[PDB]
Design a protein around this motif. Structure first.
Motif, mmCIF file in Angstrom:
data_model
loop_
_atom_site.group_PDB
_atom_site.id
_atom_site.type_symbol
_atom_site.label_atom_id
_atom_site.label_comp_id
_atom_site.label_asym_id
_atom_site.label_seq_id
_atom_site.Cartn_x
_atom_site.Cartn_y
_atom_site.Cartn_z
ATOM 1 N N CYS A 297 0.875 -1.155 0.000
ATOM 2 C CA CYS A 297 0.000 0.000 0.000
ATOM 3 C C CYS A 297 0.931 1.228 0.000
ATOM 4 N N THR A 298 1.298 1.761 1.176
ATOM 5 C CA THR A 298 2.323 2.796 1.209
ATOM 6 C C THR A 298 3.605 2.152 0.669
ATOM 7 N N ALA A 299 4.329 2.867 -0.212
ATOM 8 C CA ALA A 299 5.556 2.365 -0.849
ATOM 9 C C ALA A 299 6.700 3.366 -0.553
ATOM 10 N N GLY B 237 -9.964 10.063 5.316
ATOM 11 C CA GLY B 237 -10.312 9.016 6.246
ATOM 12 C C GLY B 237 -9.346 7.884 6.086
ATOM 13 N N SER B 238 -8.850 7.435 7.225
ATOM 14 C CA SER B 238 -7.929 6.347 7.363
ATOM 15 C C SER B 238 -6.486 6.688 7.015
ATOM 16 N N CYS B 239 -6.153 7.956 6.944
ATOM 17 C CA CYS B 239 -4.816 8.347 6.580
ATOM 18 C C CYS B 239 -4.140 9.238 7.611
ATOM 19 N N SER C 74 6.501 -0.826 6.303
ATOM 20 C CA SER C 74 5.190 -0.306 5.966
ATOM 21 C C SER C 74 4.206 -0.966 6.881
ATOM 22 N N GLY C 75 2.989 -0.390 6.931
ATOM 23 C CA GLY C 75 1.894 -0.969 7.690
ATOM 24 C C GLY C 75 1.576 -2.398 7.245
ATOM 25 N N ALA C 76 1.512 -2.587 5.922
ATOM 26 C CA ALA C 76 1.208 -3.897 5.366
ATOM 27 C C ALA C 76 2.324 -4.895 5.678
ATOM 28 N N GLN C 77 3.584 -4.460 5.633
ATOM 29 C CA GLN C 77 4.701 -5.305 6.095
ATOM 30 C C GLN C 77 4.557 -5.694 7.578
ATOM 31 N N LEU D 189 -4.456 -6.790 15.907
ATOM 32 C CA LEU D 189 -5.185 -5.531 15.895
ATOM 33 C C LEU D 189 -4.466 -4.494 14.985
ATOM 34 N N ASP D 190 -5.133 -4.148 13.882
ATOM 35 C CA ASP D 190 -4.645 -3.176 12.913
ATOM 36 C C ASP D 190 -4.579 -1.836 13.607
ATOM 37 N N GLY D 191 -3.384 -1.277 13.738
ATOM 38 C CA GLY D 191 -3.182 -0.033 14.497
ATOM 39 C C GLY D 191 -3.296 1.299 13.751
ATOM 40 N N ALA D 192 -3.758 1.267 12.530
ATOM 41 C CA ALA D 192 -3.908 2.518 11.709
ATOM 42 C C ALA D 192 -4.881 3.522 12.320
ATOM 43 N N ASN D 193 -5.773 3.082 13.215
ATOM 44 C CA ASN D 193 -6.680 4.026 13.875
ATOM 45 C C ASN D 193 -6.260 4.400 15.299
ATOM 46 N N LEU E 210 1.804 -0.373 13.905
ATOM 47 C CA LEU E 210 1.499 1.051 13.959
ATOM 48 C C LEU E 210 1.901 1.675 12.620
ATOM 49 N N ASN E 211 1.156 2.691 12.172
ATOM 50 C CA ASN E 211 1.538 3.449 10.992
ATOM 51 C C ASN E 211 2.203 4.736 11.504
ATOM 52 N N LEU E 212 3.538 4.794 11.496
ATOM 53 C CA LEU E 212 4.215 6.010 12.009
ATOM 54 C C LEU E 212 3.969 7.196 11.044
ATOM 55 N N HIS E 213 3.766 6.879 9.766
ATOM 56 C CA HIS E 213 3.351 7.868 8.729
ATOM 57 C C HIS E 213 1.864 8.303 8.792
ATOM 58 N N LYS E 214 1.080 7.756 9.716
ATOM 59 C CA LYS E 214 -0.268 8.304 9.974
ATOM 60 C C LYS E 214 -0.348 8.909 11.355
ATOM 61 N N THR E 215 -0.324 8.066 12.372
ATOM 62 C CA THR E 215 -0.502 8.526 13.737
ATOM 63 C C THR E 215 0.647 9.382 14.315
HETATM 64 C C1 LIG Z 1 -2.968 2.819 5.807
HETATM 65 C C2 LIG Z 1 -3.643 1.652 6.425
HETATM 66 C C3 LIG Z 1 -3.027 0.326 6.489
HETATM 67 C C4 LIG Z 1 -1.695 -0.037 5.857
HETATM 68 O O1 LIG Z 1 -0.590 0.855 5.937
HETATM 69 P P1 LIG Z 1 0.489 0.943 4.774
HETATM 70 O O2 LIG Z 1 1.643 1.610 5.509
HETATM 71 O O3 LIG Z 1 -0.239 1.889 3.837
HETATM 72 O O4 LIG Z 1 1.017 -0.325 4.158
HETATM 73 C C5 LIG Z 1 -3.760 -0.688 7.118
HETATM 74 N N1 LIG Z 1 -4.963 -0.525 7.669
HETATM 75 C C6 LIG Z 1 -5.599 0.626 7.647
HETATM 76 C C7 LIG Z 1 -6.929 0.747 8.267
HETATM 77 C C8 LIG Z 1 -4.958 1.790 7.026
HETATM 78 O O5 LIG Z 1 -5.614 2.973 7.062
#
Ligand SMILES: *Cc1c(COP(=O)(O)O)cnc(C)c1O
Ligand SMILES: *Cc1c(COP(=O)(O)O)cnc(C)c1O
Lengths: 953, 954
Positions: free
Chosen positions: A334-336, A504-506, A565-568, A674-678, A698-703
């Motif tokens: 997803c994020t590259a 949303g979700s970013c 990445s989050g997906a990784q 537990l997907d930590g993007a939120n 965790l998505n350090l590039h989001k949260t």
């Molecule tokens: C962005 C996101 C991911 C994955 O993160 P990437 O770093 O983009 O690979 C997973 N779950 C949710 C809900 C997201 O918003």
């Protein structure tokens, strides 16, 4: 209770007051609109009481913004900057300062995210097309993507592409690939069910027609340049594909893989002007024959037309990706690494083929000089034909050679056999050569050695094919021209220097200047990832400190930074669960329960980790359907490996009884992912570890404020409970094992801590905010989202809400009824918002035909109001269509976006004014007007006419 | 060597800096009908003044090694905590301003806002600066910056003289020492007598005092009531001038409230680095009745052609470019960029955040004071803001021994007492270090506990401020980092700059400001050193100065360089004053006549008047050259009293004079010195040198020829090179000695800091070291090629007004647009405004010849860019022909209606006899993807001066 000194002498500053958009007045008024007395009342009504923190976060005292850089400098200066000629896929380069300043340190380049809205994103789209064209020309292959995460993962993606293509379960790997590449590919093969065999070409038999493909490297890890013509031919004769890991600089003078029949070429673009970064971030390249393009992983820019017939850019063949095909996608990615791919394109632009040949020839000649001096001194070279890399058998003691190298602060690669690897690079000059000759006991200077003197240009391997002939690579060679080109592209792209991007979700929050500063410090940017660890003690402290803080925010016991990445993170996390289950004799368990509302990465990651996916239904209120959940747990209870949940949910809603879901899975022998993007709705209020979760990315590039970069870079570290810790990823060059029990899942990224040089950003946010500030940020993310929902609710249906009627950090606007009432689609609303000065929110996920809005805590009340007023005015435009006051085919919604060419033309044949078109409300003014650069994009045309390199200029 | 064959240089910076490559150069040469660059130079620069041997410089440094080379220098500096004070105070520069403004080429590459309709961003920001200064000082109108504090104080003295013509001026000896020295130097050459007197020794009753300068708080830290002193001055017709501090004034009742006429100081501590002296914007504000005598630029509110409220430089006839020797000052380049940094500081903090910082600093000082007294030390003043004067109760030696151990600097007064000035950076830890240095056996926590929450210092005094400030919405809106970034970008996008297109400003040299050159100016080792540290802390700066001096000596043929003068005009003033000190010491002090050609830049006669010279204009002949007949007659007339001539080479019209050595010899034979204005050195570097043909002194514009960024109007640096006979008379400084001999006989002090704005000198060092001797020569050659190529392309469409003997120009040329007034009622302004529609900032307008345009491309722009500019001008020539020949309305056409705003071209109402397309995209290279919009319609120059408004309207 405060000290008297604190009253006379308070804190110089509070970073939270800069980061958080709404001040006291804004917050009182927003609370008033909601009919609430305080922030505590909002939280009390939103976040369930039984999962909330029992005590506040235990963090260090907050650090004033005016001291954060000095505090971080006391850490970074513990690193030592040696000259590293280690090689192994990382080579120092001379990063052009003009690209560093005007692109990497430019908020107009780095704050935007994935180019979702092409009409306000033509700049980064063009730049990524430049990257693709560069990679195709240099490798000699037909199509290339818009970046992978790193070299080892690109190699893994090649293996998986081969399996997808021919379904064979065997894959050959040359042991002269880089060690970290081997380890990533083996790990990916293990959980996908493919058998890898480590074999030299002469030991490879394809004649069984049971080999999917072969991966080899050119030049190889020992430096050798080999002819692979016959090996590729053998593979093909038996239906196998050939994959070549390679080097863009070497390929400026070496005949490239496309010219000896290779199917997939891949590697790192790092040495094309990006810092070593102690592992990253760097864009990997990945290119294929045209016949394989339908199986391409990742994003890829293509040429298409706009509504006027103008030639324009857009992400192409998007059904390949996780967001459309989910578990059937070509990858989970997803994020590259978008921003870094654009840095490497601009390097190639600035140098042209002539400047890249200059650098490549210089590097090779330095290496040839070094080689001649070492031989004259009595040392032996194992290979006579190389690009930049020597393998040396010392004619004297290796110990005494290395003692001399330490004296000059130079690192070599130490092979297990007692021989030495030396890899020269763009930075190497006469003085460094003289140091190296002295290290090897050679009496003669570099000048002298040159006098008694070949390699690639004198060989059958010399490149004879052209590259970078398009005008983009022959036009911007003056510094004045390159600056103007980078600016032209920046200004096409709406970003956080213009307006809220409520994706949303970013989590499009503030990427602060103080947090960003350190990433280009030399003590972070210029360390080779595989240096001896006594040179990287600053990084070690950074990692310890950031781990401990992330542990405290999440309630986990250990953090692993490898996943980039989050997906990784999802993939690593799921694989770690399986290694846990395997070790404890439960390896038969492979079922993963995934609610249908999960992000597309979730099912793609689970498929990549070798799990069997069982979707779980969502009910009419947006929550996991409890009836179906209990039925799926009962069905799979013997084979249940995991569940993937998101909290709060991907529609912004807090589930009422999430511990009960965790307990049900645990009682049937599964683990909870537990997907930590939120986590922007959680930090400082509740923690996933406290309610039953075993692992989260965790998505350090989001949260945590890493910049979105136009599509990358990211970091997806995983937190785990201590029962999973012995199974965390390891690395074959730099050991990550802490305990006696270690049983690593494998290696998921090419470098041990991933993109290490961007971690200071998140360390800095956390240290400046402190426990109180981090809590306030979450509180305000929730306040801002609820305030917007409240304002919009009588104009649009807020689709899903919590038990007491509140949302979390984001909410869904249900635009679907407008299809029947007015022939209006969600895309019409998205394009029309561009005219009001806004990048659209997230479109059609988790619910098709709707919008999901996440403002973040960084935007203030006035900005929220501008967005709400835009939506209200659009609602009235829809009512004009509903009620027959304007043409239902030709109106502002249907004709959006309105380009400068459209609104400035002599013509004008619309039933509405130019003013309504381009300045629909008074806050949209000529002084702040951002123009969509093109008319509405044509999504169909581009996929029917596929063009993924720069068209002729 | 065979090493170089195998292993060539990694890179050549000249290939990045110089726009045209080999192909471009061959084609341009072809257009000129010439075989090579040497043939062009041979036909342009007279043979007898060219270099006898090539420049002797170091080997060029690769761009990929320049920062490491410079780091080996800068790391020799030591960064101590300096509580020296004396007009420079450390502050916490917001990193977001630092990144998005100071390190942003969209903010720093543009120059003075001459073209308002494509410059509304920086104009608004400077209006913000003015409003901030007026509110905090309590005075009516402020300018858009001065060079530094001491020169602002000097400008106050000169304003007083201009106002009432009295020849006496009082100076409180408790002003800062450097301020005193600049003011005394200015007065010496203007003919005013300064007298150093405490207020109680000042008698105004003779009605012979121009005015008085005092400081609040003073150099010792004291806060005094000057109400009675101001009243006395006024009772006798004298003005009152107050040097002050913007941070102190956030909690102190300001000078406007105690009747002061002029308030001034530095804005440095409002978020700008120490810079080892600069650059920093000075502020200067006055009573409304004095505004017609204001020095420098000042933004005003006016209307555009539609009635919209908009910004422009106001009351411009005050300035050097209109009034010349009658101007209110010589100042030209000022400190625009740094004024805008301080405005953004005030914007980001608001009054609430500025009060917070001010109160914090004062309370830290109050805490320090209490601890020191309890330890037995004596304070000389009980009422202060941030600054203490301490008589040590123990040995000073032992105090200083401990201070060195913690790398802390104090001010050492001559009397054996110590000055300590606290600042925004001071925290508990620093206080504890200070208390330990003074032997206190206490802590900051403990000291706070024995004070309680009683009201002391300024808030417990009759001096506490009770008047509001920064109430306008601009200071109450942009407090989040997200908002400030968006505001800075909004303004930035309004302003055309070198990130968009060539800005071919004659006499400005708008060349490349390279990223590698710019990087070092925000390194801490350069930005964060107090200008008056002990010299063993600044050994890196000393080597930088030595190296840059030696290279500048070699480029110019001079024997010594002085870096003190902080603009080109300051250089002219310093250079002229040095000539006079030379003449005075040799018994020729009666010589004061200065010959100035009428084509000289307006700074020349203003600087000469400021240096006390008598000015004799010299006529220009019909070919553009100094009139030989009139020159010989003026030299004959003034031969007994001749002090100097000011020449420019090549000339201010771009033409190389044929016999410049003869002019130098004529002046020398009659006992005068030769001043050579160095603003046109971009046509000389590496080909000829002013020192070889008889020049005695020149200023250089490092912000033109040597890549310091133009900054929207500043900062600049104008170092002077001199022949060795002038060297003993160069500027000195009273805090940091600049004397090289016992022989020294200094002119005085011209800038507040000893080497001026030291932190920006690395830019010019870097350009020079990367280019080397060959690259520097190639740059000059290409500046001349590019200028001749454009002239050649345009010559059949426009008259090229002046050329050299063999028909070539230098680095720039004049287009004579005057005939279009008769033929089409078209004015040069019409052509300037219309160019905006074609995506270009106009060239230099109406100077040196009224009604014409002067075009300087520089070497940094390539052939395609030059062609776009020439094609724009050709297409404009055809638009004029349409008017000449009656094919379009002569009142309503694109030229007359230019510029065309977005609001104009997007509106429902049109009704012009030409299309929107012709209006906004007149040629195919002007496209929606690169379209830069003028933000407003043509500006009304008359309206704003008739309705003077120089602060933010509601
Ligand atoms: C962005 C996101 C991911 C994955 O993160 P990437 O770093 O983009 O690979 C997973 N779950 C949710 C809900 C997201 O918003
Ligand atoms: C710019 C210029 C000056 C004055 O330099 P400043 O640095 O603006 O004071 C003097 N003479 C000429 C010919 C110039 O172009």
């Amino acid at each position: 209770a405060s000290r008297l000194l604190e009253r006379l002498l308070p804190r110089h500053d509070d970073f939270a007051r800069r980061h958080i958009g709404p001040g006291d007045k804004d917050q009182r008024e927003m609370l008033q609109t909601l009919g609430l007395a305080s922030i505590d009342e909002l939280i009390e009504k939103t976040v369930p009481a039984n999962i909330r923190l029992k005590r506040p976060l235990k963090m260090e005292d907050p650090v004033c913004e005016n001291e954060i850089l000095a505090t971080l400098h006391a850490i970074s200066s513990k690193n030592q900057i040696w000259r590293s000629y280690i090689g192994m896929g990382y080579y120092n380069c001379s990063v052009p300062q003009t690209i560093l300043r005007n692109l990497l340190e430019n908020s107009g380049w780095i704050t935007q995210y994935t180019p979702y809205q092409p009409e306000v994103s033509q700049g980064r789209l063009e730049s990524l097309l430049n990257y693709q064209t560069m990679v195709c020309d240099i490798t000699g292959l037909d199509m290339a993507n818009a970046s992978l995460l790193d070299e080892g993962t690109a190699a893994a993606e090649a293996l998986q592409l081969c399996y997808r293509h021919n379904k064979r379960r065997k894959f050959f790997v040359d042991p002269r690939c880089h060690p970290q590449t081997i380890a990533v590919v083996q790990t990916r093969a293990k959980y996908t069910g493919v058998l890898t065999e480590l074999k030299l070409p002469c030991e490879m038999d394809f004649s069984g027609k049971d080999v999917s493909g072969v991966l080899f490297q050119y030049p190889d890890t020992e430096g050798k340049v080999e002819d692979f013509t016959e090996l590729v031919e053998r593979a093909h004769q038996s239906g196998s594909l050939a994959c070549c890991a390679t080097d863009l600089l070497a390929l400026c003078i070496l005949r490239p893989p496309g010219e000896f029949g290779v199917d997939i070429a891949l590697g790192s673009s790092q040495r094309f002007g990006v810092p070593l970064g102690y592992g990253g971030p760097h864009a990997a390249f990945f290119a294929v024959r045209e016949s394989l393009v339908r199986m391409m992983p990742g994003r890829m820019v293509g040429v298409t037309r706009d509504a006027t017939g103008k030639e324009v850019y857009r992400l192409a063949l998007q059904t390949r990706e996780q967001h459309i095909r989910r578990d059937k996608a070509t990858s989970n990615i997803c994020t590259a690494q978008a921003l870094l791919a654009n840095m490497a394109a601009m390097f190639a632009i600035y140098h042209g083929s002539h400047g890249l040949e200059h650098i490549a020839r210089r590097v090779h000649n330095a290496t040839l000089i070094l080689s001649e001096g070492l031989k004259r001194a009595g040392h032996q070279l194992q290979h006579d034909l190389f690009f930049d890399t020597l393998k040396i058998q010392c004619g004297c003691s290796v110990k005494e050679v290395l003692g001399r190298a330490a004296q000059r602060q130079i690192n070599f690669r130490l092979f297990e056999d007692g021989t030495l690897g030396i890899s020269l690079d763009e930075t190497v000059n006469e003085k460094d050569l003289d140091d190296l000759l002295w290290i090897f006991g050679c009496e003669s200077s570099a000048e002298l050695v040159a006098e008694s003197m070949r390699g690639i240009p004198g060989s059958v391997f010399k490149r004879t094919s052209p590259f970078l002939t398009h005008q983009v690579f022959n036009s911007y060679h003056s510094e004045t021209n390159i600056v103007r080109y980078m600016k032209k592209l920046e200004n096409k792209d709406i970003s956080l220097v213009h307006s809220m991007i409520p994706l949303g979700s970013c989590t499009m929050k503030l990427n602060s200047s103080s947090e960003l500063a350190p990433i280009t410090w030399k003590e972070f940017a210029n360390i080779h990832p595989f240096v001896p660890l006594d040179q990287a003690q600053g990084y070690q402290q950074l990692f310890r400190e950031l781990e401990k803080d992330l542990c405290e925010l999440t309630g986990y016991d250990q953090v692993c930074f490898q996943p980039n990445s989050g997906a990784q993170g999802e993939y690593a996390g799921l694989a770690t669960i399986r290694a846990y289950l395997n070790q404890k004799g439960e390896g038969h368990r492979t079922v993963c329960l995934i609610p249908k509302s999960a992000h597309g990465t979730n099912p793609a990651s689970a498929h990549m980790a070798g799990m069997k996916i069982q979707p779980v239904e969502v009910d009419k209120y947006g929550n996991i359907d409890a009836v179906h959940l209990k039925a799926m747990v009962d069905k799979h209870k013997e084979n249940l490996a995991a569940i993937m949940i998101t909290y709060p949910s991907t529609n912004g809603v807090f589930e009422e009884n999430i511990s009960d879901v965790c307990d049900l899975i645990h009682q049937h022998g599964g683990q909870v992912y537990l997907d930590g993007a939120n986590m922007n709705a959680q930090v400082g209020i509740c923690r996933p570890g406290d309610f039953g979760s075993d692992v989260s990315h965790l998505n350090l590039h989001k949260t945590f404020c890493i910049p979105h970069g136009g599509g990358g870079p990211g970091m997806g570290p995983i937190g785990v409970k201590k029962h999973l810790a012995p199974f965390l990823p390891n690395h074959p060059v730099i050991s990550l094992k802490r305990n006696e029990d270690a049983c690593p899942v494998g290696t998921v990224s090419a470098a041990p801590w991933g993109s290490s040089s961007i971690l200071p950003i998140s360390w800095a946010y956390i240290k400046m905010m402190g426990g109180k500030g981090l809590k306030q940020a979450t509180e305000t993310a929730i306040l801002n989202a609820n305030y917007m929902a409240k304002r919009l609710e009588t104009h649009y249906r807020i689709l899903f809400r919590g038990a007491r009627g509140y949302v979390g950090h984001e909410f869904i606007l249900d635009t679907r009824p407008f299809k029947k009432s007015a022939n209006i689609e969600a895309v019409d609303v998205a394009k029309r918002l561009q005219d009001y000065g806004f990048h659209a929110p997230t479109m059609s996920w988790p619910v098709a035909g709707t919008l999901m809005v996440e403002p973040t805590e960084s935007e203030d009340k006035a900005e929220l109001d501008r967005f709400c007023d835009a939506m209200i005015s659009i609602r009235q435009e829809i009512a004009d269509i509903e009620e027959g006051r304007i043409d239902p085919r030709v109106n502002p919604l249907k004709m959006s976006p309105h380009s400068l060419t459209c609104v400035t033309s002599s013509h004008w044949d619309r039933p509405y004014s130019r003013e309504v078109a381009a300045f629909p409300l008074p806050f949209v003014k000529p002084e702040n007007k951002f123009w969509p650069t093109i008319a509405r994009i044509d999504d169909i045309y581009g996929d029917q006419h596929l063009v993924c390199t720069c068209p002729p200029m």
